[PDB]
């Protein structure tokens, strides 16, 4: 995020980091229950990648994080990589997340819910802060 | 890249207005947000765009794509969760 600010630690408890086996953060995701993470299809997750829950500072060794293995990758069959449309994948975890003060689920909308133009929302992540 | 988790508030756009920036690249399963002085950027992909509804944070978008320079005056594009939630629920029910 360019021109954002640091979050309060633990205040976005559904936010996960997707890391490869070298420990490199490559994408975010959101917990929707103890066993499932929603992310983007174009992130190209495999079952060798790891879901990290409960993290704030990726440079700290002292946080009580959960490193969760992925059982199966469900890429939406309507995903179109040429247009990046329908850009969603579900990850089923091999090991359930343990919910706590710092790890819990985001709500999903109904299909008919309305979010109007001009509404102020929030996005979070560990993406670049400057290009 | 940052070590510490970042946040930003930003407004939702209509797809019709987002098309002034991105043209025919904007499809019905996308939602635009930003152009407000902040931008999602590389490494944010897959994470949440959440809006508060009836007191609870609800997943409205999934960070998807946008400007190759993360310009803060151009909207970011997110996967539109309302268009996708029926597939989420079908997948959870079957697995």
């Amino acid at each position: 995020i360019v021109n954002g600010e640091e979050a309060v630690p633990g205040s976005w408890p559904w936010q996960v980091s997707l890391q490869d086996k070298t420990g490199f953060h490559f994408c975010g995701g959101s917990l929707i229950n103890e066993n499932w993470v929603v992310t983007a299809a174009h992130c190209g997750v495999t079952t060798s990648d790891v879901v990290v829950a409960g993290e704030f500072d990726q440079g700290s060794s002292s946080e009580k994080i959960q490193k969760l293995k992925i059982a199966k990758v469900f890429k939406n069959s309507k995903y179109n990589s040429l247009t990046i449309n329908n850009d969603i994948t579900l990850l089923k975890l091999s090991t359930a997340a343990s919910f706590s003060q710092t790890v819990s689920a985001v709500c999903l909308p109904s299909a008919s819910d309305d979010f109007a133009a001009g509404t102020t929302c929030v996005t979070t992540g560990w993406g670049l802060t400057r290009y | 890249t940052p070590d510490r988790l970042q946040q930003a508030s930003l407004p939702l756009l209509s797809n019709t207005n987002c098309k002034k920036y991105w043209g025919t690249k904007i499809k019905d399963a996308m939602i635009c947000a930003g152009a407000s002085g902040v931008s999602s950027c590389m490494g944010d992909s897959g994470g949440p765009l959440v809006c508060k509804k009836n007191g609870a944070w609800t997943l409205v978008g999934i960070v998807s794509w946008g400007s190759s320079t993360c310009s803060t005056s151009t909207p970011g594009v997110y996967a539109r969760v309302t268009a996708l939630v029926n597939w989420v629920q079908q997948t959870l029910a079957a697995n």
Binding site: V8, S11, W12, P13, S100, C107, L108 | G55, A56, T58
Partner: peptide
């Protein structure tokens, strides 16, 4: 869902 135990500060 959707209600953090640690409240975000925006």
């Amino acid at each position: 869902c959707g209600v953090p135990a640690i409240q975000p500060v925006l």
